[PDB]
Every structure is written in structure tokens, then in C-alpha cells.
Write a protein that binds this DNA or RNA. Structure first.
Ligand SMILES: [Mg+2]
Lengths: 79, 1341, 50
RNA sequence: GAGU
């Protein structure tokens, strides 16, 4: 948690002095941490989106209507 | 002397009226309104300026520190357009703002003399608009469509009938401010006036005034009519106003000082009123019989003791009158409530309202609004005042304020933000009037009542939203640390600002994918206007009200452009010539008619102004630059239409085409086409795909040039001059000395977009039209865009169409065509599909891009290189792999069977899933361009390397050539400056090109010109090196991608799209059809000449659907080609130019009262012969909308093209050889291949992916989904007696896993049985009922 | 409206005539969209009873 | 948007 916090606070500074975005290398410099750790924290970072979320801008599909199930094998493959 | 491209091709105009004023830039709305938001105008409260001064200067809570706004600056865009498209980013510029942190003293009174730190703080990146009026959001083109909405201000609506059996006329005033809560004042059936604050619940309007500090008496004053009643001796006298007793029957005996006037009882006429009026009547002697039933004004106490004898606004009784006058008070104040003109309204509200003082009024406010909160006085005061009179929460805007001023007829247009107290009372005033039948109601659909919100205004809105949240945060931080140590740059945040902005552009419904199928769709789409979106109506929100057509749409919105079904009535196209005033009201241009005479003065009028004046029709007949033809002319006014005289005539329609938008204007024979089909026609045009071989419309409107030019898909000359070098990549032009600036170089640069992919997959390729060394001037069309001919919109192609029945092939608007269409490659379209493959890293393993693929044929491996990348330019098929990717396979326990198997052959099966990006099923073709996205950390693959080196190759070439040819024009002018005074050619030429640093002669205004171009070489060395550096930096630099993503490969694949059976095609008249069969040339019926037919449309698809324009087009279309092929014949026979000139000029001047008088003669032979060549395959004609080519002119043309006058010819069947029993209609129709391709719309599915929860197949060929068998569909089955079909649908074909698997097995083995089970959807349902706490179960039988 | 349209599609109608026709056109097309939904609703009701 |  604490580490996440640090991240975003510094993010503002960095964005404002670079002019745009901090690349993982550049961010990792200022943190005094390893680049792959920062990269993997970014990956773990993002939280779940709702399954009922209207993905269709028109309340057309609720995410579930896209959903493929990898567990069920086809009747073809059963044969 | 016409312009040089027109000499290359003119199209003939049959219009009788000469349109005076010019074609405006059509997408000005977009350009100009976006420019509003940026506008660096000092006093103008617009965009940035407006928002900043509203927020700033923001002072600290303590009143000591403050942040002040000075000025802003926009960084020049950090990354270019194409790059944004490629890398999936939004195209945006950095904003910085000069803020001054200013610190006042506690100690010194207001000594602005503590600290000033002044600096530029970064406020984030702001999405920029493209040149064409579009936006670049997350790598894709959207447009923000202009928005209609009901303007802030005041509306007075009527409930017509509505509720009640009575049909009680219930009027109401609706107050809508720009920013803030709303007020509703509506009439009870019982005539009582109720308010709804924020339209919540109804209570008495009177109590509002109580809160405003007004007591009962002041209220009754400002609304109802005062009447003074004096008590003297023993008789009652009143101060009487003459006009008060008008139209009343009679009770008592009026005497006027002396003489009698009015008979007791007999109804007084108007004459008796003036008699008495001029008699100076100050005090008429009334009986007190009247006052029995009137009512009291103020609260009269008895001064002598001070006891409350009688209170305000009470019923009148005899006994208290006596006690009252005994209190010594002999001057009281009756009310005038006589029904009819001034009914008992406000008085009645007062009675029912048990609420008392300002206190219980404030508490009653608070109670309805926050039920369950204590009557703390502070809460009440704070609530009410801050509801309507607070600066930050309540803003009418100039817009709201000005329109409010229009309803009330207020003096000044200029408004302060808050509702003044006086505003409120005014509302109600007008309300009473109306209830009597004094006032008139406001129309919900009036044009002046709806405003249009262009992009600038809406941008400003959402920027002010980001700024509001900014204010909460910033003001909180202004009390944060110490006033000494902190910096404003650290305290000021971008997040909520840029978040709100990217939500407007990206997530808004108003920011939508544009149609780029053709320039038309683009152009039109940008100027479409929707009444929907934020602050506007939804679909359910729309009844009959707004969907229906208002007559005031005339000249402002095209009445026939709009999507059918749900969207109809909501979204319409802006008509041609209409444009927005500063306040966002639509104005239409009209010609002034100064008392009978028609001037050249153009006046733009708003809707409400338009209603007032009398306008003549565009078609009305005029006399030579003066007056009218007709004594009684055809005119409109007050919304109505009829016949009117010259003297009242104030204005007139500017041109015919001013009624309609862009799409509809192209339709030539629009006058003869019913609106059902007209509508669809304009829609269809938007869906037409350009073929590679774009053809100009032979049947046009003159319109086709302006459309194409404004779309900006073509390349146009900025200065013109002479074309020095033309490439199918770049065109360089040397400008004429007239337009050329002497300091800079005069070599103009046009980079050409070649074979580029649009949003809808359609091709945009720009080909050069003119010839090298030709002269053109400003605004001539150099390169054609995709669906464009030499400047003309070339949306489609025109073919030989015979109207006639075929052996059931042209059945119900079905369409029959010749093999020749395929043969000639007309209606073949190029489609680019862009496809990606992503290399990410899971904790399961980093995926790699390599050519390493377990267990595939080396045949497929072959197209891949060392890195796993396709060789560029290979032709690929369905199933073939483009890009190699490998993925860590998870754990799989193989059945002992497979272990055995694996042991046996020992095949090297490593835990790896084949991730490589496969080619589409049923789509194939050549890859053009592949792209690499290297992440920074891990180094690039060999292919990545090689490809970024190819980028180097190209980049370098271009800049170098840019530099060198610039010198050629520069050193060309310096030699042209060096040869004037001292004529020394030879020596200079042979003396070295780079040594001209040493050259220099005399000094005056000419050495001033030498050193100018001389310091142009010295800045090219410096500038060009920085140029080179810029390009180098961005290719190599590590692409900031999504976290977790190692690398990417997008690939553009070409598709050669052939017309085939089942494709969709239409003409301009809304007549549409699917292609049923392509017949060999032999089947095709043929002419007398032996020319075989191209397309056969069924005639019976015409008359009942009512597009007659396509028939007219047919005939005109034939006529055009007649002139063209007669020209070809005389051309093949050489002959002489003179005869050709004579015929073709007489041809131009063919039209009845045709405007265009081209007395040719002066034109040089080259221009003439060149022109004839272009018209060898048909003269391009213009019937403009509502003033084009009528029937007569058409027939004349057919005879000079050597045609039978009917335009029906006798036709021979290619099958049998026999003549048809009667002549048939043939001719050219200009048609199109629509975006809907059966190629895609074919969807094959037996079995494939299922949904997660219900376990039903997903939807669409997108994920190989199954079609839904719906409620309705079910019903079909049920109609029949088919149980097991049903059951198949319900079970084996849907959510029954057991059933479909085992039935598959049995089908393969030769069984065909069901073997039934249970739909898992139902299992789902059961357990879901059980989670609700409801018992659901199977009763065992 | 009291004044009707004198011309025919063969002749070609004018500014005012064409404008006047659009009102009815649009009303018709909107009728379609709304009315079939009410019809559909009805029919499903019937179905569900019997 | 397409169409019924
Ligand atoms: Mg049809």
C-alpha cells in the first residue's frame, strides 16, 4: 500500500517537469528501486472491472456477453 | 479568362436564378468554434479566458494568500498526428499558465506588499483538433457533433387538456438557468399558484416571497390592483379609476359630484365611461352594499390600546367596520379582485398556506428539501439564499440572461450572474396575465428557443467542470503548509482537469466515430446536429413534441436528413447557408428588399426576427435589378404561407438550395422525388464506397465542386503558380511573383497521402491531376482525393441502365448486371484492415515474438523470417500466420493414454501455447506495411532493428531533398536579382554554386534583398541539423506502452474487394437493391448500335415508391452521353477545330433561360482541344435543386444528341435475337456500391465458444457466435407442432453441455437422436432464486 | 392546410410545396417506429395469456 | 446505421 502511495505522489512532479510521462526507467530512477519491480507493480496495480459493466456504450452487452469459457472443451475435441 | 482547371473541365448549369453570394466554408462551425476555446482575445470571456477569470484570482480562506492569473501559453504539439494514430495516443498540447503567488500581510492593513512569486505552472495536456475538424483520441478519429438544446431563460407552457375530466387550462412557468437549481411555477386545477423548487413538490408561491423578506402586504401590493376608499361623515367614497368599471352590470346609483350618469342596473356602455372620466371625478359616492364581499389590505390595529382587532387579507363583516373607524382610522385599502380580468389568484394561495412569518417560511423550505432536519435558523438562511443568489453555484450566463430579458421585455441585455429579487416577481406577474387570457403561450419547438452548442462552447463547459474540482482541491491546499516554504507548482494538479477533458472527448456520446466512407459522409457527419447528449433529451424523453417538423426549420435545418427509427427527429443536418451568431442562435441569410426594390444587401436573421418580416420565395420572378414581376407575390411570414403585395415585402430567399443540407443538395431531380425516398437518398450517399476508378457525376448540380473542395480530402493549391515537379508522392510548385514573398523562398510543398486506411476500412489515395509545367492559380484542385474527380465529387460511377422486367431476376427491387462491370473493374474497392499482435508478460512467463513454432508445417513457417515476422508484400490466405508469438503453457495432466502416446513417438512437446497471430477466415490479400513497437528496456529483435533502420532510410531521403530543391528556387531568384543592373549571366553560372557567399555589387534596396536570401542559407545549416536531430530522437526512443506489455506488431493488410451477388447498391434517389445475378455479355440486351446493356433495374420498383427523379436522371443521363459520343466520332475523324467549337458552344447555350452564356471564341486552341478530350465520354450537366432542368430542356437536348424524343429505344434480346414488342427506357444512372458487404455478412457457425454464465453461445461471427433463436422465434415453432425442434433449440443447441456433446458423437456415428437433458440456464435460474432466499425445487414425481 | 399542391412530381414541386410535404412525411416515419413497439407489446401480451 |  505504502509503496503505491509513494508512486502517485511522485508521478505528478515527474509529469510536470518532464512535460509528459515518466517511462518506467525514469520513474525507477527517482524511487531508488529496480525497474522490473516497478514494471510488475504497475501490472499488479490495476483493479477489476465489473462483470455487469455496460461495455456497449448502448446498454447492449454487459461484459458477460463477450465471455468465452476456456474450461469447456468442444464436442469436436471430446471426440 | 476562367481559371486553368475549369478550362480542363467545366460542367453545364441549367439554373435560371444566379446565386449571388458565395459558398461558405461548410465546416466553419467546427473550425471557428474550436478556435473560440483557444481565443487569445483579452476582453472576450471565452474558453480559457472565461474560465480563468471566473475561478481567479483565488484568494485563501484567511484572506492573506492569493493565487492570481496572468496569461497562458500552449506548447507546440509534442507528437504528431500520424504517430498518435500509430501508437494509440490522443493528440494533445501542453498547457502552461503564468500564475502569480501573491501574499498580503496580516499585520499591514491591505499591504499588497509581502511576496510576489511569478512563474508558469503546468496544467496538463489538452486534446487538439485536427485540420479537418476532427479529433485524435486513443489512436482513432472522432468528431464532436454540434448539439441542439433548449436555451436557458424562461418558458411558459400550457397543459392542453391533460389531467382532469374538465380539461382545465393549467399554465406554468419553467425557469432554466445555465448553472443552478430550477424553478417551477404551475397552476392548481383550483386556480392556486404552486411552486416547485428544483421541481420536487408543490407548495404556495407566496411563501417564496416570505423568504425573500416580503410581508403579506407588500406581496398583495405588487400583484393586485390598489383602490383607495375614504370614510367621511356617514358616506363611502372611493378614489375611482375610469377604466375600472368597463363592462360591468349595475347595482347601486353612481353620482359624479353633481349629475347622474348611470342607470341603476342597465349595462353600461363605453360612452358613459368617458363622460364620467373627463368630468374630473375624484370621489364617487358609493353605497356600502358593494363592500359586503370585498377584502382588506393591511393589518389595522386600534392605536388607543393596541389590541389586534382585524388581520390582513380577511373576509369583510359589518361589526368590525364600526370598531375600526372608531380606532380613528378613517383611510382603508380594499382589493380589486373582480374575477375575469383580475381573478382571485394570489389571494387564494394566501388562504390555504397556513405558514406564517419569514421564519416558518424558511423552515417550510428546509423541511421539504431536507425532511428530518432541525429548524436551526442558520441552516434555513444559508439554504435559501445560497440556492439562487450564490455566485459560484448560480450562473445564468450571457445566454440565459439575454433570453430571460427577451421573455420579460427587459431594458438591458447585459446580465449579472445571480437572479435579482425583482426577476422573481416578474415571472409571476406575467403568469397571472396569461391565466386571465391576457398573455400568449411559448412554443417548445421555436427555433429561437433552442440554441446550438458548438464544440468551443461545450469544451468550455467541461473545462469549467475540471476547474470546479480543482477549486475544491486548490483552495484546500491554500491553507495547507506554511505561507513561506511551499511552491504553487507543487500544489497545482493536472489529474481531474485532464480526466474531465478526456472524458468529454472520448466518453461523451457527442464525440463519435465519423463516417469517412466518402468525403460526403465526413463533411455531412461533422455538421449534423443532435438534440441529444448532456443537457439534452434522451430517447424515452422524446415524445411526439420534438420529433415532429417545425416550419421554422426553413433555411436552417434540412428537413430531410436524419436516421430512421429511434433517432429520427433527434438528429438533423444543418442546412447549407445557415450559421451561428455569437450567442449560438442559428441565422439564415436573406436579401433585403427596400420598399419594392431588391438590393444586394445580405441580412442574417434569427428565427424570431424571421417570423416578423414578409419574405418572398426564391423561385418568385424578379425584374432586372429592381422590382418584382408579380403584383401578388408568393411569400411567407408569421410562419404562414400565401400571396402578398410588393409594398409589405421586406426580404427574399437568397437561393433555392438554402432549404437543404449537403447530401440532399447533390440529388439533381430532387423536385420530382417524394420525401420518403429523398431522405433515404441523402442517407445512402453517406454509405457509398469509392472505387479505385472514380468517375465524375454526369448528372449533377454544380454543387459537386464545392463539396469536394471543402471536404479537404483532395490537395489544393495555396498560392498557385507553375507546377515545377510532380511525383506520385509529392508535388512541388513554383509560385508566381505576384503572390510570392521576397524574403522566404517561394517553393510550395505538397506531401501526398497514398493508399491510406480510413476508419471504415475505406481507401484514401490522392492522385495528381494536372500536368507538369502547367499554370494554376489559388484554390485549384491539384490532387484528387479518393472519391473525387478533377475537383468534382466522384462518389460513384454512372452506367447504362435499362428499366425493365427480367425473368424474375429483378424481382422486388432486385438488381441484374453485366459481366462487363467486373471486367472493367468498376465498383471494385480497396479495403485496408489493420491487425495487431501483442507480446505481454504474465507471471506465467514473458511471451516472445519468434519464428519458433511447435508442430506446424514448414510451409506456413516459410513466410516468416528470423524474428517471426512476415516478409512485407507477401500475398496471404485464411489460416496463414503473420506474426509468431509463443506463450508459456500451463499445467495439463495428460491421460495415461497420452503419456503412452508421447512416450511412443517421443515428440518434443514442451509446455508452450501457440500464440502467433493468424490471418482472417474468408479474407486474403497483400500486406503493404508492418510496424514495430520496441519497448526501451529489453533490446529490439533483429526484425525490429532492420525495420527501424528502414525508417532511417526514408526519413533521411526526404529532408535532404526538401533542402536541396529549396536552394534551386532560392539561388534562382538571387540570379534573377543579380542580372538586373549589371547583366552578368555566364560568369555566374560557371562560377560554383556554393561560392556565392563572395558575390556582391551595388547597395540600395537591392543589397537589402541580397543579404536577405544570403542569411537564408546560414539558417538552413543550423535549422536542418536540429530537424535531423528531432526525427532521430523519436524512432529510437522507447515507446511508452501499457504496463505489462513488452512489444507489439500492428500490420496493415490490403483487401481487393470485388462486387459480387448479394452486395448492396443504390442510386441517388433512394432506390436500392441487392445483386441477384451477373449475366454474361451475351445474355445482355443490346441497342440498335449493338451496345450491350450494363444494368437492369425493375421499372415496377419505381412508381409506387415515388422517386421520379431517377427516371429524369435516366433520360438526362442518356442525353449527356449522346453529346459525348458525337464529340468522340468527330474527334476520330480529325476534321477541324472550328466546326467542333461551333457545335459545342451551341451545345452549352442549349438551355431555355440558361444563365451560363459562354460566348467561347477567345479561348485558345489548346484549351479547346484539351477540353473536348475530357468531354469525349460525356458532358457533365448540372440540374441544381429546384431551379434546374425542367422537362422541356431535357427533350431539346435528346434531339441535338440525335435521339428519339421519348428517350425510349427499341431493344434486341441477346438471348433470342428477337426485338422487344415495345420501346424501353434506357440511359445513364450514377450509382454506388454501399459499405455493406455480403462477404462480411456471411456467418457460418456450427459450434464454437460459449458464454460463461448461461453457457449459451455468444453472439455474432465476431467470436464465432450462434444466432439467437428469440421469444418470437420460439413462437414460430410453437405455432407448429414441433416438440423436438423446440427442444433442440432449447437444449442441445444452447445451454445443454451433455446434450450437444453426446449428440455430436451420435451424429458422427450415424444416429441422429436427441438423448435429452436439462438447459444449464435453468439450473442457473433455480439457484439464483435460492440465493434470494426463496425455496425452488424439483418435486420428485 | 387550405392551400393544396397544384403541381405533380413530373412537373416538379417548388420550395414551399416540398417543405409543406415534409411535415407529413416525417410524421409518418415516426409513426412507424413508435407504433410497432406498442403493437409488439400487445401481441406478446396476447400470447402470454393463451 | 441496415433492413423486415
Ligand atoms: Mg424498394
Amino acid at each position: 500500500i505504502e509503496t503505491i502511495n509513494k508512486l502517485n505522489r511522485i508521478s505528478r512532479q515527474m509529469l510536470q517537469e518532464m512535460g509528459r510521462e515518466p517511462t518506467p526507467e525514469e520513474l525507477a530512477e527517482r524511487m531508488l528501486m529496480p525497474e522490473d519491480k516497478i514494471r510488475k507493480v504497475l501490472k499488479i496495480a490495476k483493479e477489476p472491472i465489473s462483470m455487469e459493466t455496460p461495455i456497449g456504450d448502448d446498454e447492449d452487452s454487459h461484459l458477460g456477453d463477450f465471455i468465452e469459457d476456456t474450461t469447456l472443451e468442444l464436442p469436436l475435441d471430446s471426440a | 479568362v476562367y481559371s486553368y482547371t475549369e478550362k480542363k473541365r467545366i460542367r453545364k448549369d441549367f439554373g435560371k436564378r444566379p446565386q449571388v453570394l458565395d459558398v461558405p466554408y461548410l465546416l466553419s462551425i467546427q473550425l471557428d468554434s474550436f478556435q473560440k476555446f483557444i481565443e487569445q482575445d483579452p476582453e472576450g470571456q471565452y474558453g480559457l479566458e472565461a474560465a480563468f477569470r471566473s475561478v481567479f484570482p483565488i484568494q485563501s480562506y484567511s484572506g492573506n494568500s492569493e493565487l492570481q492569473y496572468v496569461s497562458y501559453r500552449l506548447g507546440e504539439p509534442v507528437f504528431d498526428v500520424q504517430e498518435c494514430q500509430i501508437r494509440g495516443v490522443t493528440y494533445s498540447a501542453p498547457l502552461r499558465v503564468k500564475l502569480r503567488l501573491v501574499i498580503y500581510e496580516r499585520e499591514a492593513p491591505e499591504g499588497t506588499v509581502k511576496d510576489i512569486k511569478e512563474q508558469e505552472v503546468y496544467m496538463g495536456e489538452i486534446p487538439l483538433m485536427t485540420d479537418n475538424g476532427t479529433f485524435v483520441i486513443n489512436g482513432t478519429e472522432r468528431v464532436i457533433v454540434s448539439q441542439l438544446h433548449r436555451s436557458p431563460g424562461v418558458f411558459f407552457d400550457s397543459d392542453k387538456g391533460k389531467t382532469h375530466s374538465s380539461g382545465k387550462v393549467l399554465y406554468n412557468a419553467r425557469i432554466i438557468p445555465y448553472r443552478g437549481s430550477w424553478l417551477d411555477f404551475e397552476f392548481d386545477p383550483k386556480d392556486n399558484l404552486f411552486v416547485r423548487i428544483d421541481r420536487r413538490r408543490k407548495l404556495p408561491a407566496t411563501i417564496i416571497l416570505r423568504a425573500l423578506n416580503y410581508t403579506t402586504e407588500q406581496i398583495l401590493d405588487l400583484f393586485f390592483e390598489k383602490v383607495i376608499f375614504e370614510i367621511r361623515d356617514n358616506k363611502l367614497q372611493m378614489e375611482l379609476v375610469p377604466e375600472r368599471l368597463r363592462g360591468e352590470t349595475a347595482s347601486f346609483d353612481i353620482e359624479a359630484n353633481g349629475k347622474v350618469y348611470v342607470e341603476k342596473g342597465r349595462r353600461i356602455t363605453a360612452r358613459h365611461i368617458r363622460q364620467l372620466e373627463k368630468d374630473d371625478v375624484k370621489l364617487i359616492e358609493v353605497p356600502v352594499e358593494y363592500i359586503a364581499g370585498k377584502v382588506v389590505a393591511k393589518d389595522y390595529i386600534d392605536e388607543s390600546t393596541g389590541e389586534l382587532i382585524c388581520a390582513a387579507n380577511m373576509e369583510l363583516s359589518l361589526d368590525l367596520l364600526a370598531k375600526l373607524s372608531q380606532s380613528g382610522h378613517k383611510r382603508i385599502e380594499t382589493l380589486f379582485t373582480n374575477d375575469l380580468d383580475h381573478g382571485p389568484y394570489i389571494s387564494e394561495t394566501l388562504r390555504v398556506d397556513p405558514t406564517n412569518d419569514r421564519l416558518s417560511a424558511l423552515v417550510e423550505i428546509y423541511r421539504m428539501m431536507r425532511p428530518g432536519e432541525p429548524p436551526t435558523r442558520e441552516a434555513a438562511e444559508s439554504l435559501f439564499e445560497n440556492l439562487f443568489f450564490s455566485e459560484d453555484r448560480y450562473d445564468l450566463s450571457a445566454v440565459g440572461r439575454m433570453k430571460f430579458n427577451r421573455s420579460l421585455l427587459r431594458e438591458e441585455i447585459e446580465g449579472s450572474g445571480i437572479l435579482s429579487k425583482d426577476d422573481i416577481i416578474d415571472v409571476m406577474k406575467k403568469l397571472i396575465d396569461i391565466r386571465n387570457g391576457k398573455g400568449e403561450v411559448d412554443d417548445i419547438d421555436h427555433l429561437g428557443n433552442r440554441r446550438i452548442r458548438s464544440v468551443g462552447e461545450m469544451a468550455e463547459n467541461q473545462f469549467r467542470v475540471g476547474l470546479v474540482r480543482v477549486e475544491r482541491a486548490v483552495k484546500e491546499r491554500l491553507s495547507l503548509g506554511d505561507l513561506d516554504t511551499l511552491m504553487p507548482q507543487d500544489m497545482i494538479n493536472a489529474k481531474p482537469i485532464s480526466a474531465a477533458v478526456k472524458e468529454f472527448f472520448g466518453s461523451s456520446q457527442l464525440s463519435q466515430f465519423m463516417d469517412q466512407n466518402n468525403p460526403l459522409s465526413e463533411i455531412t457527419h461533422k455538421r449534423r446536429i443532435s438534440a441529444l447528449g448532456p443537457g439534452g433529451l434522451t430517447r424515452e424523453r422524446a415524445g411526439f413534441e420534438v420529433r415532429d417538423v417545425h416550419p421554422t426549420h426553413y433555411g436552417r435545418v434540412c428537413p430531410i436528413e436524419t436516421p430512421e427509427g429511434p433517432n429520427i427527429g433527434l438528429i438533423n443536418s444543418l442546412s447549407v447557408y445557415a450559421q451561428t451568431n455569437e450567442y449560438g442562435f442559428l441565422e439564415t441569410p436573406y436579401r433585403k428588399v427596400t420598399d419594392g426594390v431588391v438590393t444586394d444587401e445580405i441580412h442574417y436573421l434569427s428565427a424570431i426576427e424571421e417570423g416578423n418580416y414578409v419574405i418572398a420565395q426564391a423561385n418568385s420572378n424578379l425584374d432586372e435589378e429592381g422590382h418584382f414581376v408579380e403584383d401578388l407575390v408568393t411569400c411567407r411570414s408569421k410562419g404562414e404561407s400565401s400571396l402578398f403585395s410588393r409594398d409589405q415585402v421586406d426580404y427574399m430567399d437568397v437561393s433555392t438550395q438554402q432549404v437543404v443540407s449537403v447530401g440532399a443538395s447533390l440529388i439533381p431531380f430532387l423536385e420530382h422525388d417524394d420525401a420518403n425516398r429523398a431522405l433515404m437518398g441523402a442517407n445512402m450517399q453517406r454509405q457509398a464506397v469509392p472505387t479505385l476508378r472514380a468517375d465524375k457525376p454526369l448528372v449533377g448540380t454544380g454543387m459537386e465542386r464545392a463539396v469536394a473542395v471543402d471536404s479537404g480530402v483532395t490537395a489544393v493549391a495555396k498560392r498557385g503558380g507553375v507546377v515545377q515537379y510532380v511525383d506520385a508522392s509529392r508535388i512541388v510548385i513554383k509560385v508566381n511573383e505576384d503572390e510570392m514573398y521576397p524574403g522566404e523562398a517561394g517553393i510550395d510543398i505538397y506531401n501526398l497521402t497514398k493508399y491510406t486506411r480510413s476508419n471504415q476500412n475505406t481507401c484514401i489515395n490522392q492522385m495528381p491531376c494536372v500536368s507538369l509545367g502547367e499554370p494554376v492559380e489559388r484554390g485549384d484542385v491539384l490532387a484528387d482525393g479518393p472519391s473525387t474527380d478533377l475537383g468534382e465529387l466522384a462518389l460513384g460511377q454512372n452506367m447504362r441502365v435499362a428499366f425493365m422486367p427480367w425473368n424474375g431476376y429483378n424481382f422486388e427491387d432486385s438488381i441484374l448486371v453485366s459481366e462487363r462491370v467486373v471486367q472493367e473493374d468498376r465498383f471494385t474497392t480497396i479495403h485496408i484492415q489493420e491487425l495487431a499482435c501483442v507480446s505481454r508478460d504474465t507471471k506465467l512467463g514473458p511471451e516472445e515474438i519468434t519464428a519458433d513454432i511447435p508442430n506446424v508445417g514448414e510451409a506456413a513457417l516459410s513466410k516468416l523470417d528470423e524474428s517471426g515476422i512476415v516478409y512485407i508484400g507477401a500475398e496471404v490466405t485464411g489460416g496463414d500466420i503473420l506474426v509468431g508469438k509463443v506463450t508459456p503453457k500451463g499445467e495439463t495432466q495428460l491421460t495415461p493414454e497420452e503419456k503412452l502416446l508421447r512416450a511412443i513417438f517421443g515428440e518434443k512437446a514442451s509446455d508452450v501455447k501457440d500464440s502467433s497471430l493468424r490471418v482472417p477466415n474468408g479474407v486474403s490479400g497483400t500486406v503493404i506495411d508492418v510496424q514495430v513497437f520496441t519497448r526501451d528496456g529489453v533490446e529490439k529483435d533483429k526484425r525490429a532493428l532492420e525495420i527501424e533502420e528502414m525508417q532511417l532510410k526514408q526519413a533521411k531521403k526526404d529532408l535532404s531533398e526538401e533542402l536541396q530543391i529549396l536552394e534551386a528556387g532560392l539561388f534562382s531568384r538571387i540570379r534573377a536579382v543579380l542580372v538586373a543592373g549589371g547583366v552578368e549571366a555566364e560568369k555566374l553560372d560557371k562560377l560554383p554554386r556554393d561560392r556565392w557567399l563572395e558575390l556582391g555589387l551595388t547597395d540600395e534596396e537591392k543589397q537589402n534583398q541580397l543579404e536577405q536570401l544570403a542569411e537564408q542559407y546560414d539558417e538552413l545549416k543550423h535549422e536542418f541539423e536540429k530537424k535531423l536531430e528531432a526525427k532521430r530522437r523519436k524512432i529510437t526512443q522507447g515507446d511508452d506502452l501499457a504496463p505489462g506489455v513488452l512489444k507489439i506488431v500492428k500490420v496493415y493488410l490490403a483487401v481487393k474487394r470485388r462486387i459480387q451477388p448479394g452486395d448492396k447498391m443504390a442510386g441517388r434517389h433512394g432506390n436500392k437493391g441487392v445483386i441477384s445475378k451477373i449475366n454474361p455479355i451475351e445474355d445482355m440486351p443490346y441497342d440498335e448500335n449493338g451496345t450491350p446493356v450494363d444494368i437492369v433495374l425493375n421499372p415496377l420498383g419505381v412508381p409506387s415508391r415515388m422517386n421520379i427523379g431517377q427516371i429524369l436522371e435516366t433520360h438526362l443521363g442518356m442525353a449527356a452521353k449522346g453529346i459525348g459520343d458525337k464529340i468522340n466520332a468527330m474527334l476520330k475523324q480529325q476534321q477541324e477545330v472550328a466546326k467542333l467549337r461551333e457545335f459545342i458552344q451551341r451545345a452549352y447555350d442549349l438551355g431555355a433561360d440558361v444563365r451560363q452564356k459562354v460566348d467561347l471564341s477567345t479561348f485558345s486552341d489548346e484549351e479547346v482541344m484539351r477540353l473536348a478530350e475530357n468531354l469525349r465520354k460525356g458532358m457533365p450537366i448540372a440540374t441544381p435543386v429546384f431551379d434546374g432542368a425542367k422537362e422541356a430542356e431535357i427533350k431539346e437536348l435528346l434531339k441535338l444528341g440525335d435521339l428519339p424524343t421519348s428517350g425510349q429505344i427499341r431493344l434486341y434480346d441477346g438471348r433470342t435475337g428477337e426485338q422487344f414488342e415495345r420501346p424501353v427506357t434506357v440511359g445513364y444512372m450514377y450509382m454506388l456500391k454501399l459499405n455493406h458487404l455480403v462477404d462480411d455478412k456471411m456467418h457460418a457457425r456450427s459450434t464454437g465458444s460459449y458464454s460463461l454464465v448461461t453457457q449459451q453461445p455468444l453472439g455474432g461471427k465476431a467470436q464465432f457466435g450462434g444466432q439467437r433463436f428469440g421469444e418470437m422465434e420460439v413462437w414460430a415453432l410453437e405455432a407448429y407442432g414441433a416438440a423436438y425442434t423446440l427442444q433442440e433449440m432449447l437444449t442441445v443447441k444452447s445451454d445443454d453441455v451433455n446434450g450437444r456433446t453426446k449428440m455430436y458423437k451420435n451424429i458422427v456415428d450415424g444416429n441422429h437422436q436427441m438423448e435429452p437433458g436439462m438447459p444449464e440456464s435453468f439450473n442457473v435460474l433455480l439457484k439464483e432464486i435460492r440465493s434470494l432466499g426463496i425455496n425452488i425445487e424439483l418435486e420428485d414425481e | 392546410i387550405e392551400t393544396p399542391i397544384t403541381a405533380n412530381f413530373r412537373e416538379g414541386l417548388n420550395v414551399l410545396q416540398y417543405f409543406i410535404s415534409t411535415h407529413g412525411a416525417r410524421k409518418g416515419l415516426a409513426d412507424t417506429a413508435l407504433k410497432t413497439a406498442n403493437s409488439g407489446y400487445l401481441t406478446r401480451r396476447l400470447v402470454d395469456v393463451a
